[model samples]
Target chain A: GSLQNIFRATSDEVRHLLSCDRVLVYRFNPDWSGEFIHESVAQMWEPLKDLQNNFPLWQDTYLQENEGGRYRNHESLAVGDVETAGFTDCHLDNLRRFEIRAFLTVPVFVGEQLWGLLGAYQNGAPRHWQAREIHLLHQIANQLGVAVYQAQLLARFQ
Target chain B: GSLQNIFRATSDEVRHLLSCDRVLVYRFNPDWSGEFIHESVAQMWEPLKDLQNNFPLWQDTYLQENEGGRYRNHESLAVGDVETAGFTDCHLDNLRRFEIRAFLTVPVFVGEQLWGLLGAYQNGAPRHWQAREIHLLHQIANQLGVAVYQAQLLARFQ
Candidate 1:
């Protein structure tokens, strides 16, 4: 089976574990733009309209500097409420459009690269992200890194 | 609006232009594992599964060495068939599992950093990658790098 199958299954499990409206695995492009690679959304929320759509990278946000350096040294970001998190108006507006009121995101790394992200979205309500959730996602992301490395090895052999 | 919308539109257009079974923008993490951030697939073909799953980095493959240094200086890779490519058994097995018979990949860079890859996959039949396709992906990846840099600048203002 392909790693995709495993990722899909993992996303579902994470969504349930976090009890959030959505849980998505977002992967970045070489240019720093990112797209949703996997997602689990609650029924009431609109399924995030686009998958594999690249969002431009932002320097004002933590992702830019993080992407430039070693992400393995970074920490997860848990936004209890976008409005109150000191985010700029543009960032807040973008979040509103995506219907995400609260968010928790962590970087996924392979070796020394910042592969993408493991994210939890709270759509209708604001959420206070917990330490346990961050820890769980971190572990999952590590496992994902290993799985991906294996797949690449297989791709090379072929 | 997020740049993701724009990327989605472009990926779809590129896939159609190439007349391939699948086209995706793959981004690498710190450790060299990668995940697809965007994809476009033909209707008759199974959508490439696991957009968010991580694939491992291979020391025996081109991708590994490239990741460690200046991939932007490297040329694109076009493999007509994995079986004849002198790939290791593990690499071949992984490709078969993914049902990919042909492959093309180009690196995308952000400044001097080795960012990720823009890739195309052909299933069901082997394909001899064309010069035009490589050229096109190369140009697009460059533009993507500029866009990402711009976003990072905007983020700084925020």
Candidate 2:
């Protein structure tokens, strides 16, 4: 409740909330090429790098290959997990497996098209997932989708 | 707007205004425990080690030290020459020397006591610290302070 509510809070409050070792929010574009941003240690507010912000193959073949709304990690087994979970041909799966141990990710949509994703991960030991936390994350993701859409629109207007 | 307004905004935008590379909004108490809730990045967002939810420090140190008011960044005189500006002390010194240049750090005052602060950092020298941005931040900080005070009062009454 502390850091989670930083969206509409003060710097001190935000700082108190996140007071963690590290926090990362990674976003993936429609094409699947992604933007990964991180904050760590004393220089916590610094954005480290823009890794894989644009990758044509990840965008074209992989994301296009999986149009249906599906997510790996906490996905249900009732659905075709093996076929739908990991990126069939893209290296996203490998990237996730390599870097991210346990993660919470939600789809970002601009109207009907899937624009991208908003994801937070817990590396090393797998973290437990809470129902309320998931719901809140979904809510935040929905808000992020709107913000991204508005940002894109504003960007175009500029 | 509360702290969330600044908290929700992308750090890059704030850094652009401050001319700083990064920003950290932290809550420090008499106990020496600091909780940094909102951390932003001009480069990347790092998810630090042992950052999993339900950590002991959050419950142990952060919440225990919670008090009142909001905090903001206030500027000070530039310390060094442009060529040697990168080596200085104090908060303003860090701003000048670091990748992010100028910063405004101020206390979030609520009635008599301080709640926390609002910080704005820059990645480069700002054209000038526009009165508009400071005024806007103050307004936002005021609203956030009220919410925080009200919540604390309510919690006490209950």
Candidate 3:
């Protein structure tokens, strides 16, 4: 969809049907580092502006431990919610104090195949999962997955 | 805007731009809850949802207590981050432990008066605040606020 189209989706129509301060769309590379494709909240760039698009730690962990489906912000006992999905002493000390409240991210899939992810942000409040919002997000991701697949197909054709 | 237009909006465009999870429109009622108008994600209706119209409480307790601008999370406090933030154990105990996470809200106004609020919630863990996200959310709030005010004016004229 065009930028205009992207901006018009409703709460009941998108992944983060809940209230969140900002949203970022990071395009994941096979290696775990990522490109920031789009964002909802503007303030994100200020702090992360100097930070490069690297998900080396996140990628390494996902490859080894991600079990597919969704992961809650605080559900992981092996890690803490304030820390990124994977622990990194270098990034962790600085990041642990960033005031992250909660998160839930589901893997995007092309049919039974894994795609990328749809992640949401909560500035500082832990949240309970909502069935409806999750359903909506999953639906949105499914649609997005198809679109992404088509985009790749068109790119290859060209 | 048509429902299609509504559905096309990115969650951030609606939440951050409008600075609210849903743009709640209620017909003028002496009892404000009586007549409901059209709603958007900035206005999506969830049952457990509190109108959270309790503005003074936020102004008096939450904002003043936390100071300003920086977002707060329910879970951080739940896990002892509150003690560091200076929240009393008793105070932390009183927070809602379900459904909603941290949130950012702005009052919608028409010139010198209040109309409604533009608010967003994250049902997950807290997130770091970003400057660009806030700016965009404020812009979205302005556009929706104007639409709301104009709508009220049209109704009054009729």
Candidate 2 chain B: 10-residue stretch with minimal lDDT: B53-62
Candidate 3, residue B19: the lDDT equals 50
lDDT of 1: 0.69
lDDT of 3 by residue, A1-158 (tens): 55324323422244245565444444556544444454444354333323463322233344334433133121212122544456566445533343344555555553224545655556654555576556655555545544454344344432
Residues A16-110 of candidate 2 have per-residue lDDT tens digits of 43232223344455545555432222243322333553322223344445642374222311111223345454444653443444555555444
Question: Which digits, one per residue and each the tens of the lDDT, describe model 1 over residues B1-158?
Answer: 45665457657777777777777777777767666666677788766545464343333354555563445574678899887899878778877866779988777665345677777788888898888777777666655654554454355432
| Top lDDT model | 1
Question: Model 3: residues >4 Å from true position, as ranges?
Answer: A1-16, A32-35, A42-99, B1-158
**i-RMSD per candidate, Å:** 12.9, 15.9, 20.5
For residue B134, model 2's alpha carbon misses the true position, in angstroms, by 1.7
What are the RMSD figures for all models against the true structure? 16.7, 20.7, 22.7
DockQ category of candidate 1:
incorrect
Q: Arrange candidates by DockQ, highest first: which order?
A: 1, 2, 3
DockQ of each: 0.02, 0.01, 0.01
- Give the per-residue lDDT digits (tens) of candidate 3, residues B58-116: 21244434432132111111121222345554444532332234444444433223443
